[PDB]
UniProtKB/Swiss-Prot annotation, chains A, B:
The lineage of its organism: Bacteria, Thermotogati, Deinococcota, Deinococci, Thermales. Its main location: membrane. This is Type IV narrow pilus major component PilA5. It comes from Thermus thermophilus (strain ATCC BAA-163 / DSM 7039 / HB27). It is found in: Cell inner membrane; Cell outer membrane; Periplasm. The chain holds residues 6 to 61 of 116 of the full protein. Signal peptide: none annotated.
Amino acid sequence: FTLIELAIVIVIIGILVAIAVPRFVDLTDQANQANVDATAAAVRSAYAIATVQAKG
Amino acid sequence: FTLIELAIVIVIIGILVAIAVPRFVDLTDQANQANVDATAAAVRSAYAIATVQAKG
């Protein structure tokens, strides 16, 4: 590579770095809560259906 | 140096010059645009992650 091409590369690397980038976040607490809540809704419906099946 | 060696040098200098050589170019506009775009992608993801953290 010519010295000019290396100079251009040295410039552009410095500009394509120094972007923002997102953090990874452990969102499993919020997702676990929604899983527990959705499951609780399912248990209530499953119970209601069971009261008809059981006739009691 | 002998006169022959100087004559040879006078010939070869004239041929190793008269190559092409690249121009340096201010490519910072294109690089800045890519930085802004990559940063915009990061802001969208950071916002999406924040809507889960905020629960709203």
